[PDB]
């Protein structure tokens, strides 16, 4: 029960700030401000009302878990992990003491735990980012999936409650994509000579 789990992350629409526009498969999201203009949006307790955030529908209370996100050409983004119990309403600071563990692109710089005091000196534009959780280790880590190089581990934290995948978009009409877990030929006929270059 020490296996690294490669998570299949699907966004939970009930968490999504109203300016967030999810794809129908809930594996991609963009931010379109005032898209509900002229609408009354019901303000259910799960939804982020100020921070343009969305969570994965998965919760983790134990073990090791990771997923990958495509962030190419998105100028303002946040990825990471947050407690299921985080404040949804108002302008909460996205920091470990409030139950958020993040890597952020902000004004051409990468920032650990969304802090202007932790600029990470990367020598390339991130394209595919690995998000890693080890619950018992208090570990949230980030990876550059181009070379599988370590970027950052947050200070070790007692999670205490279940945690979930966390996403923020701070710019408009710029989608991020959550990379599906590999499934092989799941749900597909495999010809007797094999299946080639499936899409």
């Amino acid at each position: 029960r020490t296996f690294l789990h490669a998570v299949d992350v699907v966004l939970d629409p009930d968490t999504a700030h109203p300016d967030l526009f999810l794809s129908e498969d809930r594996r991609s999201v963009r931010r379109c401000p005032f898209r509900h203009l002229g609408e009354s949006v019901p303000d259910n307790p799960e939804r982020f009302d100020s921070q343009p955030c969305v969570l994965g529908r998965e919760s983790f209370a134990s073990g090791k878990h990771y997923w990958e996100v495509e962030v190419e050409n998105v100028i303002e983004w946040t990825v990471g992990v947050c407690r299921d119990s985080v404040e949804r309403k108002g302008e909460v600071l996205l920091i470990p003491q409030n139950g958020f563990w993040t890597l952020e692109m902000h004004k051409g710089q990468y920032r650990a735990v969304s802090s202007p005091d932790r600029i990470l000196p990367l020598k390339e534009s991130l394209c595919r980012v690995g998000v890693f959780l080890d619950y018992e280790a208090g570990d949230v880590s980030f990876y550059n999936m181009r070379d599988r190089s370590h970027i950052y581990t947050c200070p070790r934290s007692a999670f205490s409650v279940p945690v979930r995948p966390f996403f923020r978009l701070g710019c408009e009409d710029s989608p991020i994509f959550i990379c599906p877990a590999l499934t092989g030929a799941n749900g597909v006929t495999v010809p007797e000579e094999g299946l080639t270059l499936h899409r």
Partner: protein, 178 residues
């Protein structure tokens, strides 16, 4: 009517959890995602398959399946004792006698190896004939009366269930004609 019309009802206890059997147990559709069902021994847990409630032990029987313009489907019979847990190739040797459509226009028989079928008309409705004793299963266009394929002089040693399989999420269900 050379052959007894079988009254075929889908056994929800056999349906892969990604399958939805209708209230009347005559039609099956695919869910986006698996339902939360137990893995009882009767359930196909890998193949997207569902059996009829009744199997055949002897005599001559017939039923009809409405496929509509569904892009993907396979139907036929299988032995009581096929592998329901994990993938097994659906072929005579593994206890499956089936044919169908894949990718909107590719008709095959699930033989070892598979064979392509040349069908003048594409069927909206298929008839399945079983003769336990001779050892014959035949597929016809139910409208045209046009032949499709036959397995000949098979040596059945077990009860045979009707079997239905759909991989794709489309709006057309697969429907047993009462």
């Amino acid at each position: 009517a050379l052959f007894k019309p079988a009254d075929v009802i889908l056994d929800p206890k056999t349906a892969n959890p990604i399958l939805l059997v209708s209230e009347d147990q005559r039609s099956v559709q695919r869910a986006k995602e698996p339902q939360d069902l137990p893995d009882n021994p009767e359930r196909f847990n890998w193949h997207y398959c569902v059996l009829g409630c009744e199997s055949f032990i002897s005599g001559r029987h017939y039923w009809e399946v409405e496929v509509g313009d569904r892009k993907e489907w396979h139907i036929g019979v299988c032995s009581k004792n096929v592998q329901r847990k994990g993938w097994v190739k659906m072929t005579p040797e593994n206890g499956f006698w089936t044919m169908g459509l894949t990718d909107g226009n590719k008709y095959r028989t699930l033989t070892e190896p598979r064979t392509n079928l040349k069908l003048p008309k594409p069927p909206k409705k298929v008839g399945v004939f079983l003769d336990y004793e001779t050892g014959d299963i035949s597929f016809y266009n139910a409208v045209d009366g046009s032949h499709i394929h036959t397995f000949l002089d098979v040596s059945f040693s077990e009860a045979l269930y009707p079997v239905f399989r759909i991989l794709t999420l489309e709006p057309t269900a697969l429907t047993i004609c009462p």
